[PDB]
């Protein structure tokens, strides 16, 4: 860091292309980090969701659901059952008679 | 089932099949017109053609 004596320089933070480069770099870095990771394509299935049986305060009513969904397994000829606790924001109602929600 | 001329007999086929959906365990019957050049005969109990 070298101080410049007797130098006046006109700045404009809204014309600074360093922000555009930082934005593009963070998008590219995020996408490159996320790409070589586990895809959840097999988990886009219908879920049977019910209410959480623990002690729920007045503000948390309807925020969590205890959902069950059959899933896949290391082998391709078998399946499994996976109970899990989801936030209401992460699931959406679907139109069915057997399952209640889908992952958003 | 539309009106065609003699030169186009057999050129276009109405083909039905079971396609997947966004959900992994929910299929969907579909029906689509294909050109004959885009399909190949394949004999089965319930099917006649497959994509070339």
């Amino acid at each position: 860091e070298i101080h410049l004596e007797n130098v006046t320089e006109e700045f404009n933070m809204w014309k600074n292309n360093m922000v555009e480069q930082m934005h593009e770099d963070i998008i590219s870095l995020w996408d490159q980090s996320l790409k070589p990771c586990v895809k959840l394509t097999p988990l886009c299935v219908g879920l049977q969701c019910t209410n959480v049986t623990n002690n729920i305060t007045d503000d948390m009513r309807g925020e969590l659901k205890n959902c069950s969904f059959n899933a896949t397994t290391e082998l391709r000829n078998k399946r499994q059952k996976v109970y899990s606790l989801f936030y209401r924001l992460d699931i959406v109602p679907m139109v069915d008679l057997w399952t209640n929600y889908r992952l958003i | 089932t539309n009106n065609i001329t003699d030169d186009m007999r057999g050129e276009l086929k109405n083909c039905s099949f079971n396609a997947t959906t966004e959900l992994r365990n929910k299929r969907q019957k579909v029906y689509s017109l294909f050109y004959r050049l885009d399909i190949v005969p394949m004999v089965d109990l319930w099917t006649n053609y497959r994509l070339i």
Partner: antibody
Amino acid sequence: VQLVQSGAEVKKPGASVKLSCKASGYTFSIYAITWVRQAPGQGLEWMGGIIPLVGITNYAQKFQGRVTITADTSTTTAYMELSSLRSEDTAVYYCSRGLGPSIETEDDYDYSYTSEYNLLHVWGRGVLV
Amino acid sequence: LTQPRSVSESPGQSVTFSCTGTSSDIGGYNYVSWFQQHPETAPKLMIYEVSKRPSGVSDRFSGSKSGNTASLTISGLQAEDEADYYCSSYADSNTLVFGGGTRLTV
């Protein structure tokens, strides 16, 4: 398309029952079986249903703790267990079949649902309980 | 889901009747079923979803739907139609509902 009911006993307060619906004439494992309550001279009320192979239920909001529908694919028989009936809602209980397959196994047990919401066809006879 | 309790008309006169509800029962989804229950016997499926028919049904019993109200017309009404006509539909929270039953006296 043959649905043969079993169990037609009216019981005293405190009782619980298990009714059965034997099925034949169609591929048992791929069609839904549902239960409908006549109510004592009132309109119909939906109780629930099951897909035998998978074994998945959707009990209604009023029966979500009482009714227990099950199915046996080896004997091709559907069962419904009704706890804590007491003497209320004495009714004729009916067993119904789906219009078409709900799941559809090509081969093996890759079920694949078919979005059929007409699960009330071949409406079998009922039993008064 | 509700419906009129009874309708009469007369033998030979085509009779129409309907069931009503909200958008979550009849308006959307397009899955409205009707059943004809004769006394001391199981209800018979008649209309499937809007305007269809399980084979074996004379003169189709074709229906219609508009807004949140679904209806059916029985053309060529006979004495054999003295039955309780029920309306049912898919309702939200992934359930089925039924109406109270319409008694057709012919």
